[PDB]
Amino acid sequence: RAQASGEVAQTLTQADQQLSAQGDQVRSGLESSVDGLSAKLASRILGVDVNS
Amino acid sequence: LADADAMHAKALADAKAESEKVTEEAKQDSERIAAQLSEQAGSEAERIK
Q1: Distance from the A16 Cα atom to the nearest Cα atom in chain B, whole angstroms
Q2: Looking at beta carbons, which residues of chain A come within 8 Å of B41?
Q3: Are B41 and A4 in contact (CB under 8 A)?
Q4: Which of A3, B1, B16, B48 is least surrounded, with the fewest CB atoms within 10 Å of its CB?
Q5: In Å, what is the CA distance from B36 to each residue of B7, B22, B25?
Q6: How many CB atoms lie within 10 A of CB A28?
Q7: Closest CA–CA distance from residue A46 to any residue of chain B (Å)
Q8: Dist. CA B36–CA B33, nearest whole Å
Q9: CA-CA distance, A32 to A41, in Å (whole number)?
Q10: Residue A47 main-chain phi, psi, to 5 deg
Q11: What superkingdom does the record give (chain B)?
Q12: Of A28, A50, A29, A30, whose CA–CA distance to A40 is shortest?
């Protein structure tokens, strides 16, 4: 059980590192997309399709 | 006295037989305990996984 706990902690830290890298490198990808979301939200609130 | 010596021998023989039998039973019990302990350890390890 001690060995299992140690290896579980190891895999946990490696998974955490890879997940942090994934989030960091996907934030940039979605940075370009969020413009569309903002524009569409503005269009909905204004009642007209605001292009900007 | 002759009967007492014969009974001594017979009781000693039965005693050694009983000792061997209980030793074998204890060995089987220890084997079962070790097997189930190992199985429980494996179950705990997979639960941790």
Answers
A1: 16
A2: 1
A3: no
A4: B1
A5: 43, 21, 17
A6: 8
A7: 52
A8: 5
A9: 16
A10: 85, -5
A11: Bacteria
A12: A50
Whole-angstrom distance, CA of residue A39 vs CA of residue A49: 8
User: For chain A, what's the residue count?
Assistant: 52
Inter-chain Cβ pairs, chain A and chain B, closer than 8 A:
12
This structure's resolution (Å) is 2.8
State the method: cryo-EM
Q: Output DSSP code: residue A48.
A: S
Q: Do A5 and B48 touch (CB under 8 A)?
A: yes
Q: Are A1 and B43 in contact (CB under 8 A)?
A: no
Search chain A and give the residue with CA nearest B42.
Answer: A1
